[PDB]
Amino acid sequence: PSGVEGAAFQSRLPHDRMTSQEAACFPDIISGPQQTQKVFLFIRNRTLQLWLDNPKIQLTFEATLQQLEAPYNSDTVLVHRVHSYLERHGLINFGIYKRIKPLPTKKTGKVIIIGSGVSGLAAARQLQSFGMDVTLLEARDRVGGRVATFRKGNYVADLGAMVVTGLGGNPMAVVSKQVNMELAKIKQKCPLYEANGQAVPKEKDEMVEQEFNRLLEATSYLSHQLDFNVLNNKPVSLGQALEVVIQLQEKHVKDEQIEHWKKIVKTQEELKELLNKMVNLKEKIKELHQQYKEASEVKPPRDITAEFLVKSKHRDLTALCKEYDELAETQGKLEEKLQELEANPPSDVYLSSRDRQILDWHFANLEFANATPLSTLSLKHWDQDDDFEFTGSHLTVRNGYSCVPVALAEGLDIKLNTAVRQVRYTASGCEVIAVNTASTSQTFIYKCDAVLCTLPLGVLKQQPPAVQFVPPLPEWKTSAVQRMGFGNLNKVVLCFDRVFWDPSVNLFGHVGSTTASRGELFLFWNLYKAPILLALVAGEAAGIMEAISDAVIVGRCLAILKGIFGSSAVPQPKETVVSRWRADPWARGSYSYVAAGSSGNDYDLMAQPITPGPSIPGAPQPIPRLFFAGEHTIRNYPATVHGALLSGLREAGRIADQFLGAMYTL
Amino acid sequence: TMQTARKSTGGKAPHRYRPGTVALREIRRYQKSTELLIRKLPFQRLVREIAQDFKTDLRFQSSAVMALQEASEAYLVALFEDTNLCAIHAKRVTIMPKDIQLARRIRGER
Amino acid sequence: RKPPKGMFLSQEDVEAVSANATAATTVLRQLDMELVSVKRQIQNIKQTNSALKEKLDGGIEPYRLPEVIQKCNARWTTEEQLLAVQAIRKYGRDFQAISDVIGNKSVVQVKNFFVNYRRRFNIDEVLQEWEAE
Numbered sequence: 001p002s003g004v005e006g007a008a009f010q011s012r013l014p015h016d017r018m019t020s021q022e023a024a025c026f027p028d029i030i031s032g033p034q035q036t037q038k039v040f041l042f043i044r045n046r047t048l049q050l051w052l053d054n055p056k057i058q059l060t061f062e063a064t065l066q067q068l069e070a071p072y073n074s075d076t077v078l079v080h081r082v083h084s085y086l087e088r089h090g091l092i093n094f095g096i097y098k099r100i101k102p103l104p105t106k107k108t109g110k111v112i113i114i115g116s117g118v119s120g121l122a123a124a125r126q127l128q129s130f131g132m133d134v135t136l137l138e139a140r141d142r143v144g145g146r147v148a149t150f151r152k153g154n155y156v157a158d159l160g161a162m163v164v165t166g167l168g169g170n171p172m173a174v175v176s177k178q179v180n181m182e183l184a185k186i187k188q189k190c191p192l193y194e195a196n197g198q199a200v201p202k203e204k205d206e207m208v209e210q211e212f213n214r215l216l217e218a219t220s221y222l223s224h225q226l227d228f229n230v231l232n233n234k235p236v237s238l239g240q241a242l243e244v245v246i247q248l249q250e251k252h253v254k255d256e257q258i259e260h261w262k263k264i265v266k267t268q269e270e271l272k273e274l275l276n277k278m279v280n281l282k283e284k285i286k287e288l289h290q291q292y293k294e295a296s297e298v299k300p301p302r303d304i305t306a307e308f309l310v311k312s313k314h315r316d317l318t319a320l321c322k323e324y325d326e327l328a329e330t331q332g333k334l335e336e337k338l339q340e341l342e343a344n345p346p347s348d349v350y351l352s353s354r355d356r357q358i359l360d361w362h363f364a365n366l367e368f369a370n371a372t373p374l375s376t377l378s379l380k381h382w383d384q385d386d387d388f389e390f391t392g393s394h395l396t397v398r399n400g401y402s403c404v405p406v407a408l409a410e411g412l413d414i415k416l417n418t419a420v421r422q423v424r425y426t427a428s429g430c431e432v433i434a435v436n437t438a439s440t441s442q443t444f445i446y447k448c449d450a451v452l453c454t455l456p457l458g459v460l461k462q463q464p465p466a467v468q469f470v471p472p473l474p475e476w477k478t479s480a481v482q483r484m485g486f487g488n489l490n491k492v493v494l495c496f497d498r499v500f501w502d503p504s505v506n507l508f509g510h511v512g513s514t515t516a517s518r519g520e521l522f523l524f525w526n527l528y529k530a531p532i533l534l535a536l537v538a539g540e541a542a543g544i545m546e547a548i549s550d551a552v553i554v555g556r557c558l559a560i561l562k563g564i565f566g567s568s569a570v571p572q573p574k575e576t577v578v579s580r581w582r583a584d585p586w587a588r589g590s591y592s593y594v595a596a597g598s599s600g601n602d603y604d605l606m607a608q609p610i611t612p613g614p615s616i617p618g619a620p621q622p623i624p625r626l627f628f629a630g631e632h633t634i635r636n637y638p639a640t641v642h643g644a645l646l647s648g649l650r651e652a653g654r655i656a657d658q659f660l661g662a663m664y665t666l
Numbered sequence: 667t668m669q670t671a672r673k674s675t676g677g678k679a680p681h682r683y684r685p686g687t688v689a690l691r692e693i694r695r696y697q698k699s700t701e702l703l704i705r706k707l708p709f710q711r712l713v714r715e716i717a718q719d720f721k722t723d724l725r726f727q728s729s730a731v732m733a734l735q736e737a738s739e740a741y742l743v744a745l746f747e748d749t750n751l752c753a754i755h756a757k758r759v760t761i762m763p764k765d766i767q768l769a770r771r772i773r774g775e776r
Numbered sequence: 777r778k779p780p781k782g783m784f785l786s787q788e789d790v791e792a793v794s795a796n797a798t799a800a801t802t803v804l805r806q807l808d809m810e811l812v813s814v815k816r817q818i819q820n821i822k823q824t825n826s827a828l829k830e831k832l833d834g835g836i837e838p839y840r841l842p843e844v845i846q847k848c849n850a851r852w853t854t855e856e857q858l859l860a861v862q863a864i865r866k867y868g869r870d871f872q873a874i875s876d877v878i879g880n881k882s883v884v885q886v887k888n889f890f891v892n893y894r895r896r897f898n899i900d901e902v903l904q905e906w907e908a909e
């Protein structure tokens with residue numbers, strides 16, 4: 001919508017209702033009259049609207065009260081408390097913006113952030129804007145973490161992050177209004193060519209996609225209704241459920257065949273009993289035909305009572321011949337049915353290898369959106385975040401998405417080439433042990449009051465751990481680490497010197513010959529200035545394709561392009577880059593995914609900080625020291641870049657929740 | 667959620683009875699009982715009026731009035747039976763004065 | 777939430793295929809054996825009906841008599857009345873049969889014959905004797 005309600009929709013907040021977070025901070029307003037609640041909703045959403053109108057400067061709080069409801073002076077400094085509440089938790093004044101009021105020259109508190117990714121950069125600048133000392137420890141020689149961009153001359157290609165999922169409600173729209181981001185829309189037209197290189201007709205492509213959507217509707221009702229979630233004392237995946245359903249449709253075809261032959265043996269037996277009655281009646285008619293001829297040899301007036309006996313046998317014969325004529329009519333009706341339904345049985349409608357190849361492509365596309373095979377996704381919670389999708393079309397970054405983390409790193413104190421070894425947290429402070437990537441013997445020690453960990457979950461699940469925690473994490477925390485998984489996908493950059501595809505088509509698909517290799521080079525992309533194609537590898541083959549050299553992968557990419565457009569129409573590429581996120585020791589995979597046996601509660605458990613025990617026996621409850629962030633710590637928006645962006649804003653908002661005013665002192 | 671090309675369509679999901687009921691139930695109630703339906707005192711005064719026009723200064727035995735009431739109600743109930751049959755014969759359900767007049771015409775009561 | 781158009785999906789079939797490692801193969805083989813069984817039943821019954829059709833070669837064409845097309849009369853003769861009496865005795869209330877036996881009396885005239893000559897011919901006794909057989 002527009003106005004106050006439109007600003008609430010843009011900030012993921014209900015326009016006519018208060019969230020649970022707004023109830024815990026102001027319990028007096030939500031438990032009071034309804035009119036006071038509406039005033040709080042209006043003040044919040046109006047300041048949201050003022051921020052969304054001008055996100056490039058600091059939305060102050062004195063001009064907000066001055067430009068709200070004429071001279072508005074009927075509140076005892078209530079706008080101050082509400083504005084400071086909203087600006088801290090990242091609901092209003094979200095992202096990184098130029099601040100009018102200067103930062104405090106003396107900072108309060110020291111925080112070490114592990115990893116300079118989107119989450120590590122957002123929470124850092126928020127920590128710094130709040131008046132705290134920040135130092136980022138990055139093991140890579142750059143920032144962004146899982147945000148990679150290949151830049152060489154005029155070729156731009158993103159090896160990890162570039163496309164978004166819309167601007168409606170997404171804080172990325174404000175980031176695009178803040179950081180110079182050229183956004184280009186994605187044309188959803190994606191033609192499909194088989195292994196031979198020829199395209200798929202419209203009627204065939206629409207029927208396989210419709211059957212693919214029908215199998216996803218089977219997925220929905222197997223999950224939310226049949227509760228098919230326990231099999232052999234183990235959680236049920238999805239690839240098994242879909243394959244069973246498909247085999248049941250082949251059973252439905254066989255049953256339709258059997259029932260069709262059952263209806264034929266049924267009518268054929270009716271013809272059997274009908275013909276047997278016709279034979280028996282023909283013999284009786286033949287007998288009566290022999291009888292009355294002897295009665296005709298005598299004159300009718302000669303003997304007596306012949307007119308009764310002759311017409312009686314004549315009427316009975318006439319009645320039986322009339323029935324035989326109607327049974328002959330039914331015989332003709334059954335014969336024309338045995339000529340109409342003989343060569344047209346309603347059968348022979350499976351899925352075949354024709355539709356299976358395209359169905360394997362759709363499965364690979366679904367495996368790409370999750371970076372894991374369908375046999376690892378939980379049937380119950382694989383689309384648990386499917387209700388929080390963003391509105392609008394899908395857009396890309398025309399000039400590489402790395403322009404965001406490089407711009408967010410402006411003014412921060414980031415330690416590049418610094419890998420963290422141990423993480424010590426006690427009741428009086430924290431100590432981070434880190435080394436230099438150029439020489440592992442050089443060790444660095446940083447003191448701080450709190451530590452924010454943005455490391456991927458796949459690193460913590462692997463034993464031995466690459467980063468040790470002292471004291472070790474509790475069993476419930478490590479169990480949530482091991483239950484969840486970490487997906488994998490890769491990209492292959494193909495830099496050419498001339499356009500040799502269809503410029504108006506941004507992406508085209510290539511189906512696989514087999515099911516095991518369905519996620520092997522199934523989709524290429526065109527959406528940058530230079531003629532560049534972006535191949536996609538996913539599934540179980542993705543991990544195997546990483547063990548293969550770059551020349552073979554590019555040779556397979558060229559062989560597919562030559563098989564579709566021709567050998568002469570396909571020149572040789574100039575630069576080729578292949579990504580290996582699983583082989584990357586600083587990622588150990590691609591991005592998060594709901595595994596079988598896990599749920600959305602595990603994302604919230606990753607969001608919960610840990611509190612170390614007291615150093616002195618008998619000391620009170622210490623202050624929570626170690627907090628985590630990243631894409632795998634947010635429940636509603638996992639596996640995205642704004643999810644990690646909101647995680648940094650979340651921990652930024654939890655600063656005041658940790659401080660909780662100055663009431664506990666007196 | 668990371669579906670940017672050909673998204674997965676699936677995976678998203680006072681009381682008043684009707685006229686005629688009390689009447690029929692009242693019919694059943696009176697067809698089971700045999701109590702007199704016209705009240706005794708207004709009927710007794712009506713008969714006294716009718717008798718005054720025949721002979722003056724007359725006294726009635728209480729049993730004489732009850733016998734007059736018995737024959738009168740039986741005549742009227744039987745007449746309404748014939749009256750209801752006439753109304754149903756005319757493709758109607760409602761009795762009308764033409765039905766009683768037709769019934770008394772067939773009976774020969776002129 | 778609801779099975780798709782022309783598609784049945786029950787919990788029993790899902791559990792049967794995933795009963796063990798070779799459950800789907802067992803079900804498919806049993807369905808194929810049932811398909812072979814119904815097909816040979818088609819072949820045997822088709823052979824039986826072909827033989828039955830071979831027995832009906834010629835129809836009842838040599839056993840058909842021409843129609844005695846004659847108008848309906850109006851007078852009842854003694855012969856016609858007695859033929860009606862005997863027709864009631866054997867057929868009863870089959871007016872079409874009695875009309876065809878007499879030949880020159882339509883169905884409506886036979887039905888009228890029952891009423892006009894009911895007592896003079898004891899038709900009630902003739903009908904109750906037919907009902908005894």
Ligand SMILES: Cc1cc2nc3c(=O)[nH]c(=O)nc-3n(C[C@H](O)[C@H](O)[C@H](O)COP(=O)(O)OP(=O)(O)OC[C@H]3O[C@@H](n4cnc5c(N)ncnc54)[C@H](O)[C@@H]3O)c2cc1C
Pocket residue numbers: 114115116117118119120137138139140143144145146147159160161162163164165418419420454455456467489490581585586587589590591629630631632639640641642644
């Ligand atoms: C391949 C891929 C493509 C994507 N494409 C898109 C897209 O087109 N559009 C979109 O909207 N989203 C996309 N996403 C989603 C988005 O990029 C991520 O979900 C999100 O950015 C993750 O950010 P993060 O800070 O949590 O992870 P990271 O930023 O990776 O956090 C870890 C960071 O710290 C570094 N690090 C690792 N180990 C250490 C260590 N020991 N010490 C210090 N630093 C360390 C890493 O190098 C990394 O920079 C994509 C994700 C992936 C994986």
